[PDB]
């Protein structure tokens, strides 16, 4: 009720023993009443790491997209090793979304090992289940072997109608994924544990399909982008390997449907000046000159007749003596070129000022035998050359032509494919202009450049014309146990790419959301432009390039930081060597670096001196020391995880306030969220994502579904909370419902359409579907839809929500009116009360927890102790939790090695992982998520609670309670204990606790029993007894 405290555990297990006397009664009662329940004490397990690999083939659907909807691929298993290292090799294959599916290694939902189907942004099939939302779904198939080796499984996807299908060993499965959102781009994904070998079959060139695709679905190998080569890569990675060693990489520039759709400028609405007709035909005449030039350069020749294919020139005169068809043919496109110029901002009019007279018009090949042709080039480029502004104008003009052509091709219906299937309207060059290779770009802009030369020869007067994006930034900082408050240190940062790369020293309590340098807790230097950053931008040094190493020495004796670039001290504008001065001792400083989107660096802290380049150039004789040099193990580092997470409300927040009031009369106990600085300067207003901390879990199965009757209240199953919207708050900005632990959407232009709901349909294999089941990661409704007011609304809406632990029927109630919408979820959903709001008034939200007609309070739902009490209550554990954009997370000291390579046109690409890696995971029961156990090295409160939990475990089985010790062995396994013994990154208190727990639950009674007998020396008469002598014979 009050929360997780160590002092409560001390109070509990003061009953463990007294003066060295065990109390079996209290020991068994505490064991039986805490250890089977398991909602309070955190639990720890051993798992093995997983890795997800994708092909770089991103295909999606939107309004007018240039992509095809249907695609098909296969995976064939070479070999699996089941139950490797005491855990089954998890292996799922399916489809995943670039925008939303981030499979960060280590931790996550459930007990970690998050694969394809452990989220609503990806759907997979491991052989027997269609995994989605961390939930397995058994399905009947002809062969149920869970991807045994030498088995080939196909998977196809349709975007025009949302559909995902699998064909295990050629035989299709009886399940189909459908009704999923179509946002972003979908790619194949294979999630695997170690000790596995698979092959990615893409058909056609890269590999060959074992089974031909069903009609409609196309091979994925043809969807490869023109400038991209088919490469297997980790999906969302923050670390790679290079020449020097581990290379830290930042985020990546990802595509979507927005850049796959073209949006051109309409040029048919442009008025025609006289200059239109001024140049419309002189451009056409030079165009005819290029026509003669092209037929000369080709195998064609001179002729009077109207057939270029037979070595004939239709015009047969220098000036085109062209009929109505071809005259209009050149007329309209010359005009349209002028229309695009005017629309996009190029000026119009060609005042040559004797430049036409200067124009030679004498570059004639003279191959013509008669009056045909005789069109000479006028040396437009030689007389007047292009300028870079005009060349970029050429690029965007050809882009506009590409986009209008793509627009009409899409309107009639065309698809992108690397093979140009004309009868299928397939073409590899219909995607927007920002994606075609350099050949198409040059071939579509070179004639435009020649047209620009013609304009220059004509003397043309043409003149050339809240989301902080935490996803694009990543902060990497050494662990807070390595802080230095004295000494002189030095750590290198090597640059692989040139981007927004920041490097320096930061206070250990730096905020992950705000970027480096903006806060006073970061003395950082951005080497993209050389500028340093303590409380703002400051010009300094010089911008760097690829291959440059920055030295970043700090000395706390002189309270300064000095940066070196390639062994030479960077110099400030004023000429000062030190970038920052007058630094207080503070709490210490830590090596930190920020990487922009698509940046690669090498943060060499200085573990090995020979690897540490340029240290002798600057630092060996200067008295500075390599940061973390003598430490044998590599330094653990923490990266800013971009996955948003709910955290408890901070009372230190200067913008939001929560007031908790209990004992209210004619009112349930309430928590009011208000804006501390509404309508003031520098006030942040964004989407506020609330969530009450405690979960609500359904019963195991759905066996049976106003001064109320006490027995009916005791028999009820439903619960009801009410959120109250204040005057001045827009009901259209309020969303009330139910969040699963898997909710990680932080977008501030929130729409109910953006939520992820997906349905799974399992039926007869021959085509009679019977079972369908829908799920969603969220269950809000749109408050504007509910109010239907259609303008300040002073009325207070109590938009309350119902939930019954049986039959999953969730109905709503707005301003005392039953709701026409309902939701249905399977048992054991573990939902959370939630409300989303856009602050528009001083008073914003009031959570209200109480009872209603035939209604059991939500407090009685979330707390088992008061399940019979109808009185509403607000114990300190329940609280408002707000979403936070980013949070720190540990990077494991070792990552899974994967070897991926292609073998042949038939075999294709193969993925192999052999070395197994095991991680200990600490699972928080309420949030249904696990962190790495080593992550507690900076989470000191959870460290305190887990150390005291180990103390509880030791002393419930202390003093020879072998029954309870056996009961403990389920919680704490033998292999678990062995790994906690062997590892070195375990914190101090946890290490001592686990060692003493092993001794207590396995060796304490036996050791005591032997110790009580070592006092005596009862010795019998044996031939071994006559063997002992005082001095052994040397």
């Amino acid at each position, epitope marked *: 009720k009050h929360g997780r405290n160590h002092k409560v555990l001390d109070v509990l297990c003061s009953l463990c023993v007294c003066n060295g006397v065990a109390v079996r009664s209290n020991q068994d009662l505490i064991t039986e009443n805490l250890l089977p329940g398991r909602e309070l004490l955190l639990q720890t397990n051993l798992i093995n790491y997983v890795t997800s690999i994708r092909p770089n083939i991103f295909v999606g659907r939107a309004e007018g997209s240039t992509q095809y909807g249907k695609w098909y691929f296969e995976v064939m298993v070479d070999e699996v090793v089941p139950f490797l290292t005491a855990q089954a090799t998890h292996l799922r294959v399916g489809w995943a979304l670039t925008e939303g599916y981030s499979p960060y290694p280590g931790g996550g939902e459930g007990w970690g090992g998050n694969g394809v189907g452990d989220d609503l942004y990806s759907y997979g099939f491991d052989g027997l289940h269609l995994w989605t939302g961390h939930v397995a779904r058994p399905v009947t198939s002809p062969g149920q072997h869970l991807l045994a080796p030498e088995d080939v499984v196909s998977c196809c996807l349709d975007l025009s109608v949302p559909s995902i299908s699998f064909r295990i060993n050629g035989c299709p499965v009886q399940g189909v994924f459908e009704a999923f959102n179509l946002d972003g781009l979908f790619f194949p994904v294979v999630s695997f544990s170690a000790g596995v070998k698979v092959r990615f079959l893409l058909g056609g060139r890269h590999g060959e399909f074992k089974f031909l695709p069903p009609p409609g679905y196309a091979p994925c190998h043809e969807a490869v982008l023109p400038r991209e080569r088919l490469r297997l890569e980790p999906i969302k990675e923050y670390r790679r390997e290079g020449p020097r060693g581990p290379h830290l990489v930042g985020p990546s520039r990802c595509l979507s449907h927005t850049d796959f759709v073209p949006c051109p400028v309409d040029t048919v609405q442009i008025v025609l000046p006289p200059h239109l007709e001024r140049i419309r035909e002189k451009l056409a005449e030079n165009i005819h000159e290029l*026509w003669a030039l092209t037929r000369i350069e080709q195998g064609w020749t001179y002729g009077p007749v109207r057939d270029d294919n037979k070595r004939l020139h239709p015009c047969l005169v220098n000036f085109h003596s062209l*009929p109505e068809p071809e005259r209009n043919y050149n007329l*309209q496109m010359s005009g349209e070129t002028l229309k695009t110029l005017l629309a996009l901002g190029c000026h119009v009019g060609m005042a040559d000022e004797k430049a036409e007279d200067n124009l030679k018009k004498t570059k004639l090949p003279k191959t013509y035998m008669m009056s045909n042709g005789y069109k000479p080039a006028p040396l437009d480029l030689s007389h007047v050359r292009l300028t870079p502004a005009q060349t970029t104008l050429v690029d965007r003009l050809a882009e506009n032509g590409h986009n209008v052509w793509a627009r009409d091709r899409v309107a009639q219906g065309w698809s992108y494919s690397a093979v140009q299937d004309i009868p299928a309207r397939r073409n590899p060059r219909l995607v927007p202009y920002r994606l075609l290779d350099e050949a198409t770009k040059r071939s579509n802009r070179d004639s435009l450049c020649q047209a620009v030369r013609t304009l220059l020869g004509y003397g043309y007067n043409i003149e050339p014309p809240n989301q902080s994006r935490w996803d694009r930034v990543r902060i990497f900082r050494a662990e807070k146990s390595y802080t230095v408050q004295s000494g002189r240190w030095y750590f290198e940062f090597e640059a692989v790419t040139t981007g927004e790369m920041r490097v320096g020293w930061a206070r250990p309590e730096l905020r992950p959301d705000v970027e480096l340098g903006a806060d006073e807790l970061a003395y950082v230097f951005n080497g993209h432009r050389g500028q340093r950053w303590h409380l703002g931008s400051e010009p300094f040094g010089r911008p760097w390039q690829s291959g440059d190493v920055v030295g970043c020495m700090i000395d706390l004796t002189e309270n300064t930081i000095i940066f070196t670039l390639n062994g030479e001290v960077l110099m400030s504008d004023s000429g000062s060597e030190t970038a920052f001065r007058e630094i207080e001792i503070g709490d210490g400083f830590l090596p930190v670096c920020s990487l922009g989107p698509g940046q690669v660096g090498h943060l060499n802290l200085g573990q090995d001196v020979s690897s540490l380049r340029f240290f002798a150039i600057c630092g060996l004789q200067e008295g500075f020391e390599p940061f973390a040099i003598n430490m044998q193990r590599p330094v653990t580092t923490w990266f800013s995880k971009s996955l948003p997470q709910f955290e408890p409300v901070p009372p230190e927040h200067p913008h939001y306030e929560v007031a908790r009031m209990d004992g209210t009369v004619d009112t349930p106990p309430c928590l009011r969220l208000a804006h501390r600085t509404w309508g003031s300067q520098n006030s942040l207003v964004e989407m506020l994502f609330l969530r009450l901390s405690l979960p609500v879990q359904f019963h195991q199965h759905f066996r049976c579904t106003n001064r109320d009757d006490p027995e009916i209240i005791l028999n009820t199953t439903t619960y009801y909370y009410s959120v109250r919207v204040f005057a001045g708050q827009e009901p259209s900005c309020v969303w009330v419902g139910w969040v699963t632990p898997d909710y990680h959407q932080h977008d501030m232009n929130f729409d109910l359409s953006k939520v992820r709901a997906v349905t799974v349909t399992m039926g007869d294999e021959q085509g009679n579907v019977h079972s369908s089941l829908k799920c969603s990661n969220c269950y809000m409704v749109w408050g504007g839809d509910f109010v239907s007011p259609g303008r300040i609304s002073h009325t207070d809406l109590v938009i309350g929500c119902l939930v019954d632990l049986a039959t999953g029927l969730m109905t709503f109630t707005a301003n005392g009116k039953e709701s026409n919408t309902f939701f249905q979820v399977e048992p054991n959903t573990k939902l959370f009360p939630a409300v989303f709001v856009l602050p528009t008034h001083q008073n914003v939200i009031q959570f209200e927890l109480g009872k209603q007609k035939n209604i059991m309070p939500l407090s009685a739902a979330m707390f088992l102790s008061e399940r019979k009490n109808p009185a509403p209550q607000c114990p300190p554990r329940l609280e408002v939790q707000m979403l936070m954009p980013v949070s720190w997370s540990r990077m494991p000291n070792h990552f899974l090695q994967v070897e991926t390579r292609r073998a042949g046109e038939r075999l294709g690409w193969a993925v192999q992982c052999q070395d197994p890696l095991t991680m200990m995971a600490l699972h928080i029961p309420e949030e249904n998520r696990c962190m790495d156990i080593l992550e507690l090295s900076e989470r000191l409160d959870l460290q305190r609670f887990h150390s005291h939990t180990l103390r509880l475990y030791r002393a419930v089985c202390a003093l020879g309670n072998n029954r309870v010790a056996h009961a403990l062995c389920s919680h704490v396994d033998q292999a678990q204990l062995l790994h906690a013994l062997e590892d070195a990154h375990l914190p101090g208190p946890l290490r001592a606790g686990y060692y003493d727990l092993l001794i207590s639950i396995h060796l304490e009674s036996a050791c005591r029993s032997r110790r009580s007998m070592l006092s005596e020396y009862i010795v019998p008469l044996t031939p071994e007894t006559r063997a002992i002598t005082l001095f052994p014979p040397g």
Partner: nanobody
Amino acid sequence: QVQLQESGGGLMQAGGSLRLSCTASGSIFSINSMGWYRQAPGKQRELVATITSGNSINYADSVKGRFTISRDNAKNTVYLQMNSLKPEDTAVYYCNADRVPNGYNPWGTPNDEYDYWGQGTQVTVS
């Protein structure tokens, strides 16, 4: 877009006089050249006759066949008077519209890219 109807011909015996009237309407653009294409059995799209504004027949492939293509720009409806029905004429026909007359392209590849193919109908020779 330009979404023209391809029709004309059908089942016929050898040497069958067929008027393949491919109808085009609802199109302001790509009214210059109105080409005819043909998929022979196991063959690519072979152009047969590309009429042009002013009723100008194009001769690039299969000039020998008496295609006799004609069109008026008033209604943009083309009609192909094909009598010669060779065995390889047992095949399918297509009707494309574009504003680049065949045998005349001094701009580049996008101008050729502007074209609007047809539905596709069988003309069978027996």
